[PDB]
């Protein structure tokens with residue numbers, strides 16, 4: 646048997662569709678499974694969103710205070726609800742968007758990037774600027790949770806998002822000082838313990854951004870480093886469209902997919 650057969654069994658067992666991509670390196674072949682099929686971003690767009698805002702502004706822009714109201718909180722926003730009275734700086738928003746997957750923080754970052762009607766097109770244009778012609782963001786949270794399976798809106802592919810993440814973390818899409826902020830926020834993420842992290846041994850370093858949604862959607866995108874500093878990019882995406890809109894996401898599906906990947910990357 647081969648790795649595609651292992652990934653197929655994961656699908657049968659969880660009644661799920663799984664997509665995996667890990668770029669080739671000098672010493673490892675690409676891992677690709679449904680790598681060109683579309684999957685909802687869910688919250689994973691917030692990583693390249695923070696990069697867009699870092700890229701387009703001096704670091705001093707991170708100190709800009711954004712004020713907002715309870716009316717702006719229409720999605721799960723653990724950090725933004727706490728700071729609604731005093732406001733949050735662009736920096737704080739980037740922090741929240743990545744580390745708590747904060748929906749209001751992402752929406753305010755979208756508005757900072759392209760204005761109130763223009764944010765999702767501007768975010769998408771950032772992706773186009775990086776050579777990603779595939780991904781698209783069309784709505785903001787929470788409206789983007791309503792796209793049904795098969796709708797191209799608000800989707801990426803394992804291929805596309807891993808390659809974006811690669812440029813951002815391991816390439817030169819950002820200058821070192823901006824890159825480090827992205828990397829720090831993803832390193833300090835609070836939401837991915839049970840996903841890619843759970844597939845990799847404790848001496849591999851992991852940074853990540855998750856997403857979850859309706860139709861059983863669960864994603865994670867990460868950069869991992871070997872104990873000797875060898876970097877790899879892992880995108881794992883899933884949905885469970887079988888069980889309808891209220892199908893439960895399965896984090897363990899992602900942990901298992903990650904374990905299959907780690908078995909390839911870690912075993913010499």
Ligand SMILES: *C(=O)N1C[C@H](NOS(=O)(=O)O)CC[C@H]1C(N)=O
Pocket residue numbers: 686687688689720721745746747748786787790836854855856857858859
């Ligand atoms: C992101 O997909 N979302 C924001 C928040 N955190 O989820 S994540 O950690 O899996 O990124 C809650 C769910 C979801 C949403 N529906 O907007």
